[PDB]
Amino acid sequence: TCPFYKKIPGTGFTVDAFQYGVVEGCTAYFLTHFHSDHYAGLSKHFTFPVYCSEITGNLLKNKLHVQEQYIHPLPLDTECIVNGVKVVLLDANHCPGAVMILFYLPNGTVILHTGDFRADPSMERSLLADQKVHMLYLDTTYCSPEYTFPSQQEVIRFAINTAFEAVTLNPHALVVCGTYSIGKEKVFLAIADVLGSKVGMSQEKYKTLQCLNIPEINSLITTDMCSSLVHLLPMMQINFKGLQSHLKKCGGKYNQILAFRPTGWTHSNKFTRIADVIPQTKGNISIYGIPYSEHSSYLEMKRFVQWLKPQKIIPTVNVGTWKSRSTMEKYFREWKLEAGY
Ligand code: NI
């Protein structure tokens, strides 16, 4: 059944709740972003109102074929009324089109649902600064102190410097980048920019990127693989067998592959700096796992919550085990006692 952490009290609303059939009492279904664990269940047969960003609504129309009449896109940073309730969508610093949602309940309670987010100090100057938030529905993906990772900027600097050096030493090297969802487009776009290439990809993935309102996108991507020396492949193909096979397909244009897997966290983060990352190599193929995150680190999450000072926190991630739920509740109490709210 629909879990309680997907329901907004005092409303008929649900968030990211499309796989339970008709949720009894739901008048509006919000979708925070276009990732499959969140949209699971939507299709051309859905006939209830879906509220979302403009970019998420482009993907629902073009990739899932949801009918236009049920897609209700809202502008960001704008007070809107939905079924009698004031709401605001805020940028979540996750993937393209991802939002956080502020609900202003008729009784005076204010609720923030973060969706999936990577907390940032810039959020402390949005419309969130303007009133008190009583309840926080929080993306707790990396809510443990072992989860450190570098800034997105540091990781892209590493990637650009590594690719540029490799291709300048060997003009016959191909760069490959893995993907299995939207998000992390900076990785492949920044590498193609330094190399003076467009990124080549499948027709399905090009269609997906043409929904994202990225500026000058027609100048950066292509379905012509032959004209490109940065290829995007399914994350599943980023291994020695898959990459050897791909290299055969390129008809002797290339004699070396340098590949990137933009993982979330990996336990080499506890020991190793970004400066010191090394690849796995077999023959003329090298694979780099780079810690490019679109979720909060522990410290980023802690700073946001100690700034916001909510009265009640409802985790939305890692809620399936008692040991995880108890650990998270212990951190929330520490943060509150340290900061004095
Ligand atoms: Ni997500």
Side-chain angles (χ1 to χ4, degrees), residues 1-23 25-203 205-215 217-240 242-247 249-269 271-281 283-311 313-341:
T1 75
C2 182
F4 74 101
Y5 65 86
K6 292 188 182 277
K7 295 168 164 193
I8 304 304
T11 72
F13 303 157
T14 61
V15 180
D16 298 350
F18 295 91
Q19 65 169 292
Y20 306 100
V22 182
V23 174
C26 186
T27 64
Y29 294 76
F30 284 78
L31 180 58
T32 61
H33 64 292
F34 199 72
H35 281 168
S36 57
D37 280 358
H38 303 261
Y39 63 72
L42 276 168
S43 79
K44 70 168 67 167
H45 307 297
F46 200 83
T47 50
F48 296 103
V50 178
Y51 289 85
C52 64
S53 65
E54 177 186 353
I55 284 162
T56 297
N58 293 342
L59 294 155
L60 292 177
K61 177 185 169 183
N62 290 289
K63 300 294 294 184
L64 299 184
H65 306 291
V66 170
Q67 304 171 34
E68 211 144 49
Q69 82 176 134
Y70 308 109
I71 304 172
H72 302 255
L74 316 174
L76 301 194
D77 302 316
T78 300
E79 297 185 327
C80 296
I81 310 311
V82 173
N83 297 357
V85 175
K86 180 162 68 167
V87 302
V88 174
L89 300 192
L90 305 163
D91 203 280
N93 189 35
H94 184 52
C95 64
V99 297
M100 316 192 285
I101 313 159
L102 261 183
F103 300 95
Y104 295 78
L105 269 39
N107 80 0
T109 302
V110 178
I111 297 175
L112 179 59
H113 195 304
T114 68
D116 284 343
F117 88 142
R118 180 160 187 179
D120 191 75
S122 65
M123 296 172 172
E124 305 163 15
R125 301 167 275 284
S126 60
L127 300 195
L128 282 178
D130 300 13
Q131 80 294 283
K132 187 185 174 54
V133 173
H134 303 88
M135 302 176 77
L136 178 57
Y137 289 61
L138 179 60
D139 170 20
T140 47
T141 299
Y142 296 125
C143 187
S144 200
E146 64 269 35
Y147 298 114
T148 56
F149 29 64
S151 70
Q152 292 176 165
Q153 190 270 338
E154 291 176 76
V155 174
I156 288 307
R157 179 92 292 208
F158 173 84
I160 288 167
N161 290 357
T162 302
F164 181 74
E165 174 185 303
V167 179
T168 298
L169 293 168
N170 180 190
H172 302 272
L174 173 62
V175 179
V176 177
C177 290
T179 185
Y180 44 33
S181 56
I182 64 164
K184 305 189 192 176
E185 287 81 8
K186 197 69 173 174
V187 179
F188 53 89
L189 303 173
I191 291 170
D193 178 75
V194 86
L195 298 177
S197 181
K198 302 197 183 176
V199 184
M201 61 195 74
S202 75
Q203 293 178 250
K205 181 73 183 183
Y206 182 89
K207 174 177 182 182
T208 300
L209 300 186
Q210 283 292 168
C211 299
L212 308 182
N213 296 351
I214 287 167
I217 194 60
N218 300 329
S219 73
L220 318 172
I221 61 173
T222 187
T223 59
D224 187 357
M225 314 291 286
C226 289
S227 63
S228 168
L229 58 141
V230 182
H231 299 173
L232 303 195
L233 298 180
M235 199 73 82
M236 284 197 68
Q237 206 171 347
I238 312 300
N239 51 71
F240 297 116
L243 290 165
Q244 287 167 199
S245 175
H246 183 71
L247 190 60
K249 278 161 257 177
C250 292
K253 203 161 199 304
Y254 308 107
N255 62 6
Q256 180 185 5
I257 280 170
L258 183 115
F260 297 89
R261 297 189 337 88
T263 59
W265 166 85
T266 54
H267 184 67
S268 2
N269 266 300
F271 308 115
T272 310
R273 264 168 157 77
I274 190 75
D276 323 337
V277 161
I278 61 161
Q280 272 194 238
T281 295
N284 62 333
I285 294 174
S286 288
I287 304 174
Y288 282 90
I290 58 170
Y292 191 92
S293 185
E294 290 186 341
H295 296 272
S296 315
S297 72
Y298 172 86
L299 289 171
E300 294 168 341
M301 192 189 298
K302 179 172 181 283
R303 177 188 170 129
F304 181 81
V305 178
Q306 289 182 310
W307 171 79
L308 192 72
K309 307 176 167 61
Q311 300 177 355
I313 301 174
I314 303 176
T316 64
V317 188
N318 302 313
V319 295
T321 81
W322 299 116
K323 189 179 143 215
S324 307
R325 283 197 157 283
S326 182
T327 301
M328 293 183 293
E329 292 171 0
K330 285 181 27 266
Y331 295 127
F332 303 148
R333 189 57 61 173
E334 299 182 5
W335 301 348
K336 178 183 169 71
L337 285 166
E338 182 187 29
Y341 53 98

